[PDB]
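// run 5 | inverse folding | seed 20
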């Protein structure tokens, strides 16, 4: 399984992608430098050729409403991953949140 937050982290980990998505250097903050290019790549990844940023952005909002990300104030395309105990559990268990016997 691959969901959007993981996909973004995969792109962010490779600094050769910095011209369209980058860790800003402020903690866990990242910027979508070319939002439609990020969306295009997500569409390729998921075989959804009609993917676009409008669609992708819904997931960003779902993540910040759930406290997995935060939207940075004053910015359009700057977000941060949340580093807290509860968010770490959600990120550790994307597919099963009753993982123990």
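// decoded
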């Amino acid at each position: 399984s691959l969901q959007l937050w993981q996909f973004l982290v995969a792109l962010l980990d490779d600094p050769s992608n910095s011209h369209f998505i980058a860790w800003t250097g402020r903690g866990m903050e990242f910027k979508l430098i070319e939002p439609e290019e990020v969306a295009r790549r997500w569409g390729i990844q998921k075989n959804r050729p009609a993917m676009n940023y409008d669609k992708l952005s819904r997931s960003l909002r779902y993540y910040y409403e759930k406290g997995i990300m935060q939207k940075v104030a004053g910015e359009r395309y700057v977000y941060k991953f949340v580093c807290d105990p509860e968010a770490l559990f959600s990120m550790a268990f994307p597919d099963n949140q009753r993982p123990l016997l």
